[PDB]
Amino acid sequence: ELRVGNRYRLGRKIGSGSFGDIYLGTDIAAGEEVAIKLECVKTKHPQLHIESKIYKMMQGGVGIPTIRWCGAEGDYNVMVMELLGPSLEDLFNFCSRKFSLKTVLLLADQMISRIEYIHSKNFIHRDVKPDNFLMGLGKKGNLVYIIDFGLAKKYRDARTHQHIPYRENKNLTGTARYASINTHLGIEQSRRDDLESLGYVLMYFNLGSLPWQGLKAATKRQKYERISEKKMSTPIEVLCKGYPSEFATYLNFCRSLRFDDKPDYSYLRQLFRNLFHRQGFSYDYVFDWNM
């Protein structure tokens, strides 16, 4: 059988992320199913080792997947990770593409804390999207994980907390649908941009779709610019109309952060936490997919 690490049976391809493909694998020893990321070694700028080092720096964090093994075999760099449960996009589809307010708020609280944690380790994620959040397994089925550090970048020095300089003409990184407005404008990303993207993700869960989704386009350049210009032309107060004002406050707060500002994560969490209590929700972690 085809094995990597002389321990991991390789199975079918199950997705493609930053700079590499993801495969199902089986810990042929432990007997557990795993996820296996492969990067073709035939490149002048390999990334998987860099990503692995970011994960390993993160593993003191709640909701960061465990790395099981890192190595090079034949034509591929290999990173084996703990296999988690479905992505938030998967669960969104299981729930026919609408989440209740309570689920969105329960998710929002944990997703802000994952991003805060990454920032506390001097990195920005730069690919905040529903597919990059996965629920845990078993007694960790209530826990939201964040994955994929292939687009991550250090935003400050560990010692001085000197922020990376302000720069323009930086290329777009992750998905267009959730990119911050500044990212469309080619501005270097910082902490504010991870959080603004989360704001779009939350409104996506509330609405079923964002207003810059499904814009008719013949070529694929004209589909991106219609995303960019609909996102730039749709005020937050229009985007969040008919939803609790916290979501508009969240997005306005994130859009108004200065490039090098430290976000007040606690205030953002309390915004949603206080709304959670006003709606009379309880913390029983019964998400839409548990019903």
Author numbering: 2 to 292
Give excerpts from the publication.
Mutations in CK1δ/ε (hereafter referred to jointly as CK1), as well as PER2, exert powerful control over circadian period, altering the intrinsic timing of circadian rhythms by hours in vivo. PER2 is regulated by a CK1-dependent phosphoswitch, where kinase activity at two antagonistic sites functionally interact to control PER2 stability.
Because anion binding at Site two is incompatible with the activation loop in its ‘loop up’ conformation, prior crystallographic conditions have likely disfavored this alternate conformation.
